[PDB]
Design a protein around this ligand. Structure first.
Ligand SMILES: *[C@@H]1O[C@H](CO)[C@@H](O[C@@H]2O[C@H](CO)[C@@H](O[C@@H]3O[C@H](CO)[C@@H](O)[C@H](O)[C@@H]3O)[C@H](O)[C@H]2NC(C)=O)[C@H](O)[C@H]1NC(C)=O
Ligand SMILES: *[C@@H]1O[C@H](CO)[C@@H](O[C@@H]2O[C@H](CO)[C@@H](O[C@@H]3O[C@H](CO)[C@@H](O)[C@H](O)[C@@H]3O)[C@H](O)[C@H]2NC(C)=O)[C@H](O)[C@H]1NC(C)=O
Ligand SMILES: *[C@@H]1O[C@H](CO)[C@@H](O[C@@H]2O[C@H](CO)[C@@H](O[C@@H]3O[C@H](CO)[C@@H](O)[C@H](O)[C@@H]3O)[C@H](O)[C@H]2NC(C)=O)[C@H](O)[C@H]1NC(C)=O
Ligand SMILES: *[C@@H]1O[C@H](CO)[C@@H](O[C@@H]2O[C@H](CO)[C@@H](O[C@@H]3O[C@H](CO)[C@@H](O)[C@H](O)[C@@H]3O)[C@H](O)[C@H]2NC(C)=O)[C@H](O)[C@H]1NC(C)=O
Ligand SMILES: *[C@@H]1O[C@H](CO)[C@@H](O[C@@H]2O[C@H](CO)[C@@H](O[C@@H]3O[C@H](CO)[C@@H](O)[C@H](O)[C@@H]3O)[C@H](O)[C@H]2NC(C)=O)[C@H](O)[C@H]1NC(C)=O
Ligand SMILES: *[C@@H]1O[C@H](CO)[C@@H](O[C@@H]2O[C@H](CO)[C@@H](O[C@@H]3O[C@H](CO)[C@@H](O)[C@H](O)[C@@H]3O)[C@H](O)[C@H]2NC(C)=O)[C@H](O)[C@H]1NC(C)=O
Ligand SMILES: [Pt+2]
Ligand SMILES: [Pt+2]
Ligand SMILES: [Pt+2]
Ligand SMILES: [Pt+2]
Ligand SMILES: [Pt+2]
Ligand SMILES: [Pt+2]
Ligand SMILES: [Pt+2]
Ligand SMILES: [Pt+2]
Ligand SMILES: [Pt+2]
Ligand SMILES: [Pt+2]
Ligand SMILES: [Pt+2]
Ligand SMILES: [Pt+2]
Lengths: 186, 188, 188, 186, 188, 186
């Protein structure tokens, strides 16, 4: 499933076949490296307990034979693989679900003339912030953010006479924006 | 003169025809609201004193008969008029110089999709920060915020229901300065 | 329903006789002072939006024809009445549910002896913290403080001159909830 | 001597026999491990100097041939052994005095029902904070505090049907309180 | 009695002719603005209680028939009058004692040269901090500042154009206390 | 050149002979140990760029064939040697200039009687704060400050009867002040 940052989102699991609902002992885990398990919460007979680190971040519920992991507001740490362990008696079945969290890209353009040796060089900067894959490219004719998003910036230095307009292509997988520097202040 | 934000800048002045160099008493004033003349500093006989509030932000020096007010890193408060008063004995001449401080525009584009009743509405946001005159406008195929640095920000939202009227282009300006941002395709 | 402080809690609602599941527009409201209905969130066609002030604190989901408001960790502000509004076309039905939040009582006993004119007077202090209704009372053989968490504290002092009228028993209550604390012997 | 937390308290020493009052050079030390000496203050000819770390915490004075260490407000760091060194000429006599600081016990009772797998288990918690020796015990039919006191807590888990009332016995040497959980909210 | 800032100090009192030691109820009061008597502490039968606001700052003890109020580290707020009230049965006697707290003066000298129009003017600054009575005066060959500690500071500037009228001597006082600071030669 | 703390100050350099003004590429460096170079700024064709650590602290300019380093407000870190590198083509000439920063001295006198064994000893303290060379000396008949200045203090202990007046001599190279303790409070 794909969620955008801040959106409610849901993963689901079910046992089989097996149609036994509230009798199944359900636990959901967030998977780390290399598939290391961190318990989010447990459900049995429609009594649910969320572990304190995930409280308000995740909930669990049942509808018939389907088990739900709900993410109240997706953030970038929530990206990746989850494990639903379903247990009846001394028997057990696990299912893996994937959540893709996507921060829509922000494309910024800004320019700055040189200050030494003279003021004749226009450096145009193009910045893409996004998740998972920001990408930046100039046409002529990197950093980790507090929220876990990634920023990339590229400078184009332009000797006089300035090759204006220049177009910046920002991408986040299939998402794309352009930034066009058209003319200088002077 | 025009200076971009952060740049070393220079205003200049000289007297005439009067080649007297260090004999001339020079004082530089920042002109305020107002009519008010606020002293930056003085130079005479190659002794330069810069008033405490301006220290580090402005300097004064002479090259022969030319007098210089140096702004060490142009900030938006430095935008406005300046006065160089030159004195010899009982006679004075005054020269008025303008400094334009410009922050080059930053244009940003980003989109967000709707979360209720469904996920079908794209809102695309275009933000221009600049000084003195940011302006933004959406093309198809809200206050001024004052930032900490004195520059001004302006933002416009455009909502697109399905089918998204894509290629949308944002036009940003700051006087003659111009940039665009084009939202081409969503992530899906 | 009754929830202790910190517990996951659930209010439920369904329409009738009307087995329409995802076709029904559900909204949940917290009832305020007041007469005021404050929107927690909405569900329709299995798209759930929780208002920003309630995000993380409440969730909404459906199981077939039953609608659930989940409180993720019951706090004392959550105590009160809730409204589930169910809509189909132009017709609505509304269900009012109550949540009672209870903090289980804490009873504390401690004694302190007098320091002047001498060391012979024992004062024994009994403190009950709970929600909604802490109450304390001393048996032989002062404001309500509002805590940060919304719970209420109540304290009673009993002074005993020599010979100390020991076994003293403190009785603490919170509605039907009951605890005692008995001061048996001093340190000497 | 026994002082309770916050009470003024006094230790005393004297030389012998020897009846020579203000002529004796008196110094008091707080004893650490293993009897390590830390100077509190000195007295001679009724001139007294308290070392800055103990200033406002301790004073010293004389009455005739008796030397006094006064503790202005006993705290738990003041618990333990003190040394009075009494010096006349190149001769010297030391006496050891003991201060017991006692924090009267606080007994707390609180209960909490289980949240998973169901809500049927009552865990009753009984906490004793005290100094020197808090102790807790349940009848059916650990941590160090900022002020230097010690807290101990014990949980009794009760399956349904709840074995109510349960009585908690708190002790601090001979000090004793009981905590009785009598009935649940529901 | 006189105590310098930071010193252990003692006021004393006794009754008469009345050799009753521990039988006497003693209380010590700090006298305020005002006419107001503020209780420091009490002693009776060798039980001493010091009021919470004075704890650590003052103590009381007895040696036979003499009663002592000990100030553990004299501060400037301790300067003023004190009352020892001695009681036996229904009869009382009261003794008034004065504590003078003195901060010994600090005298500082420093010079600064002028920066405009030239470097030829020396200003020499002399600062006296003390309690109760700092005073400063320049000899040839402006408020009181209240410091955090209750002491008082006083500063005088003397400008000297070339040729500098050197040996200049600063005279500092605090009642009978006296110090000088002499500026002898500049750095050049 | 000598500057006092807080004063504007100037260093100058020139190439030769060579009379070619704005054609020369000028860079000024602050010298550390052992002559390590830290760039302050560069000038060429009367375009000047000051490096951000020195911005508002230093400026550079030309008057004809003379190159100026200006220090806007001298502080103690600015004390020591500077290097002017002057470059034309692949040829280069460097000149060393020295700035002496001087904090005028502050002489303080204060006295304090003993507190143990009795109150009969007058300790008079004399403190000189200065830069570069504070010095203190008592006549009978060390520390580094936040601003980089140096403080030195000397105590004179005086048994009764007090040898008053005592005179303190403060020096900072040729700068000199005296402090005279003339009489006690009591
Ligand atoms: C993204 O979501 C994750 C949860 O899935 C967020 O992490 C959680 O953040 C909370 C709030 O900080 C953590 O609780 C803090 O814990 C420490 C004790 O270790 C304590 O000092 C605080 O009072 C508070 O309880 C919680 O442990 C943590 N959960 C996990 C599983 O890491 C993350 O902060 C979210 N936001 C962003 C922007 O990433
Ligand atoms: C833009 O440049 C102006 C200066 O031309 C900057 O203003 C000056 O700012 C400094 C603080 O860095 C002020 O110095 C402070 O003044 C207070 C107020 O009396 C004093 O308490 C402090 O110790 C300190 O000296 C200075 O007076 C002020 N000068 C003016 C306004 O003429 C301004 O900070 C810069 N703005 C930005 C956004 O960088
Ligand atoms: C008990 O639960 C209620 C929620 O049902 C908690 O109140 C909510 O508390 C949060 C803060 O954690 C508020 O979010 C903040 O609001 C301010 C004000 O506009 C905003 O500046 C912050 O950025 C942040 O979003 C939220 O609005 C508020 N919701 C309400 C009152 O409906 C409350 O904090 C909990 N109380 C305790 C004692 O835990
Ligand atoms: C219990 O009583 C002892 C004294 O018998 C208390 O310790 C003393 O606490 C004072 C106040 O903190 C200490 O003075 C601090 O010293 C540091 C320098 O090391 C400085 O940063 C502060 O301005 C202040 O002077 C004092 O040194 C310390 N004395 C000893 C002998 O340790 C203890 O704090 C008392 N209270 C409790 C609750 O334990
Ligand atoms: C000089 O000595 C006097 C005492 O004789 C000092 O005043 C006392 O100062 C303490 C604080 O260290 C006060 O204790 C505090 O009072 C507040 C106010 O109610 C309370 O919130 C705090 O928890 C704390 O107990 C005390 O009441 C006060 N006594 C008085 C004024 O009689 C004073 O601090 C000393 N001054 C200097 C400059 O050292
Ligand atoms: C004496 O003058 C020197 C400069 O010649 C002063 O040093 C400079 O001080 C500024 C202001 O702190 C430094 O900029 C700080 O840099 C850090 C990053 O490393 C950043 O956290 C701050 O926002 C700020 O930019 C500057 O780097 C430093 N320059 C040098 C060459 O060291 C010194 O502070 C002056 N004053 C005194 C009393 O010494
Ligand atoms: Pt996916
Ligand atoms: Pt970044
Ligand atoms: Pt010239
Ligand atoms: Pt803004
Ligand atoms: Pt369904
Ligand atoms: Pt309270
Ligand atoms: Pt003992
Ligand atoms: Pt604890
Ligand atoms: Pt006695
Ligand atoms: Pt002051
Ligand atoms: Pt020099
Ligand atoms: Pt120092």
């Amino acid at each position: 499933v794909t969620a955008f940052l801040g959106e409610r989102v849901t993963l689901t699991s079910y046992w089989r076949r097996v149609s036994l609902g509230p009798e199944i002992e359900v636990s959901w885990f967030k998977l780390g490296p290399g598939e290391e398990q961190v318990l989010i919460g447990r459900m049995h007979h429609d009594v649910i307990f969320i572990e304190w680190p995930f409280r308000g971040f995740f909930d669990i519920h049942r509808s018939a034979n389907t088990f739900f992991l709900v993410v109240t507001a997706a953030n970038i740490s929530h990206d990746g693989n989850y494990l639903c362990r379903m247990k009846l008696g001394e028997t057990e079945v696990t299912k893996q679900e994937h959540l893709s969290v996507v921060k829509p890209l922000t494309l910024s353009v800004h320019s700055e003339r040189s200050q030494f040796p003279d003021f004749s060089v226009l450096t145009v900067t193009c910045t893409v912030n996004a998740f998972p894959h920001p990408h930046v490219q100039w046409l002529m004719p990197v950093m980790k953010e507090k929220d876990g998003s990634l920023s990339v910036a590229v400078d184009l230095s332009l000797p006089k006479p300035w090759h204006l307009p220049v177009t910046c292509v920002g991408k986040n997988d299939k998402e794309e924006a352009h930034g066009v520097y058209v003319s200088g202040y002077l």
